[PDB]
Every structure is written in C-alpha cells, then in structure tokens.
C-alpha cells in the first residue's frame, strides 16, 4: 500500500539534500508530486499533524525542567494563567496533590537560570512552597549556539515546506545559499543539535522511590505495560524524595489506579503517588528562540518592580 509505505516513510529521518521528497518518492517508488499531493491530505486530515525538524532542547542550551506550585483553589485558576502566559512554559496541568499546579518550564540560554525564573515566578503569585524537578526520559556535547544556529532554528523550528524545494526559502529568508543552509543544518545533525526531520482521556503522572541498581529494570517493566508511556529519573532531594516517574493513562482512576497496586504489588514498592490530571491549561510546543520569552521576563521584571 502507497498509503502505508509513504506513512511509514515519512516518519522517517527526511534527508537533508535539496530535492528530499525526490527521494523519498524514489524509495517509495512513487512519482515525487505525487508523494507531495499524498501528504498534504495525511496533514490535513490529522493522522499526522505536523512535520518539522525536531531539535534537542538541551544541545540548544534551554535548561528545562517540571515546576510544582502548592497554590489554594482559590487562587488556583488566577496562578494557571499566569503559568501559561509564559512561552516557554509548554504543558501545564492542575494535579491531586499537596502541590497542585504543575507545568514544564523550559529557559533559553543567557538570560536567567531556571531557578530564578521560577522564584519571581512564585513571588509575583506569592506562592510559598516550589519545587523545581529536573527529569530525564529513556557521545554529544553542548557547544552554546551562535546568533546564526539561533536563526537558523527559528525559522527551521516550523513546519516543514511540502514543496521540491524545502530549504531554498529558509535559505533565502536567511541569505544564504540552500547549499551553506544544508552545511550548518547538517553540522547540527552531527552535533545531535538535530536529531531529525519527520513527521508524527485519564491520566497521571505516577511518582515512585526505587534504589537506583534497580530503576534501570524497574523502568523498562513498567516500559512494557499498556497505560503506561514514557518513563523519567531524577535524583531524590529532601523536598521530593521520589526519583522515578511513569505517565500513566486509562479509563480513569479506576482503570489507572488499579493498573498501579499490580506494580507497587510485583516488585515491592510501597513508597508511590498518583498525580491526577484533573485539568489542561496548556499543552503546546514552545518555539525555540522566539523574542517573546526574552521580553516576557522584561514584563516580569518591569511588573515585579
């Protein structure tokens, strides 16, 4: 099936020459226009939503991590929307817990430390009790990223043209050449900057603490069950002493609650928490290097004084 092939194609790391769609076209053994014809209507109809570069938040050099407000419901709603007005802000979610605002903060490189964007954060919604979580899921180096790699990824950072040409206008919006374009862009690729050109109900965050020679097995069985998606590590602190988190969904609690006694049950862990989403605020994609973050700050800094 072309549909099938061409699904599976793209998803794909798409190459980084001029003419990529000629050989993917090629390699699906389909005629390029229409290949192109063929993913617009995948794109339009929303199987796939989007295809663009995806880009690694760190090797960029965003610091970024899981913020935690303890706010009153009172003031619950007020702080959510404080949360989202920030652009690096790129999920935020109301959670059952002590600590019942949490969103993922993301900061550019050279502006503030992430911390101290969080502490006027809390101070200018005088919330009291914070926590700051640095999570990772499951050789490259950071090299800081020069004005140009800044530009460059800014306007690379959208939606890639469905066009024969998919570099020529971010070359000529950026003045150079496709063929000095693909030479950055693919210097970035072997830097890991880049990782890729593709496309692509109840829920909780499930929080344990697991001795680390076990983490390791622990995440990759709770890897293996349906409900649950992507799991994270951290290190334990005196304010947050679980180190392992597993995103977990299902038909509500029920469904969900159950499919987590099985765990703490088949490996021993008595010391969890189950984070419910019990409400969306935001859940969208942060733009890299965009001049709103930078003067958002401006706006905090000009507010709080």
Not at 174 to 193: C, P
Request: glycine content about 4%; charged content about 30%.
């Amino acid at each position: 099936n072309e549909f099938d092939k061409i699904l599976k194609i793209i998803q794909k790391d798409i190459p980084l020459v001029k003419e990529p769609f000629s050989v993917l076209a090629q390699e699906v053994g389909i005629e390029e226009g229409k290949l192109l014809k063929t993913i617009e209507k995948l794109v339009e109809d929303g199987i796939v939503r989007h295809i663009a570069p995806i880009y690694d938040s760190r090797l960029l050099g965003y610091d970024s991590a899981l913020i935690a407000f303890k706010v009153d419901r009172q003031k619950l709603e007020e702080v959510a929307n404080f949360v989202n007005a920030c652009p690096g802000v790129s999920h935020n979610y109301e959670r059952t817990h002590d600590f019942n605002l949490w969103f993922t903060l993301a900061v550019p490189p050279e502006i503030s430390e992430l911390e101290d964007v969080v502490r006027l954060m809390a101070e200018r919604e005088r919330v009291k009790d914070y926590l700051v979580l640095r999570v990772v899921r499951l050789v490259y180096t950071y090299t800081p990223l020069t004005e140009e790699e800044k530009r460059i990824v800014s306007i690379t950072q959208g939606s890639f043209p469905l066009v024969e040409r998919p570099f020529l206008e971010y070359a000529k919006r950026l003045r150079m050449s496709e063929e000095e374009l693909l030479e950055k862009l693919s210097a970035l690729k072997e830097r890991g900057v880049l990782r890729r050109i593709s496309a692509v109900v109840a829920n909780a965050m499930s929080v344990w603490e697991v001795p680390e020679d076990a983490i390791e097995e622990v995440g990759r069985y709770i890897a293996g069950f349906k409900g649950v998606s992507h799991c994270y590590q951290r290190t334990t602190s005196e304010k947050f002493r679980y180190n392992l988190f597993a995103m977990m969904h299902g038909k509500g609690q029920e469904e969900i609650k159950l499919l987590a006694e099985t765990i703490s049950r088949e490996k021993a862990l008595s010391k969890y928490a189950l984070l419910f989403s019990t409400r969306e605020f935001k859940k969208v994609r942060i733009k890299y290097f965009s001049e709103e973050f930078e003067r958002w700050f401006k706006e905090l800094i000009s507010a709080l004084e």
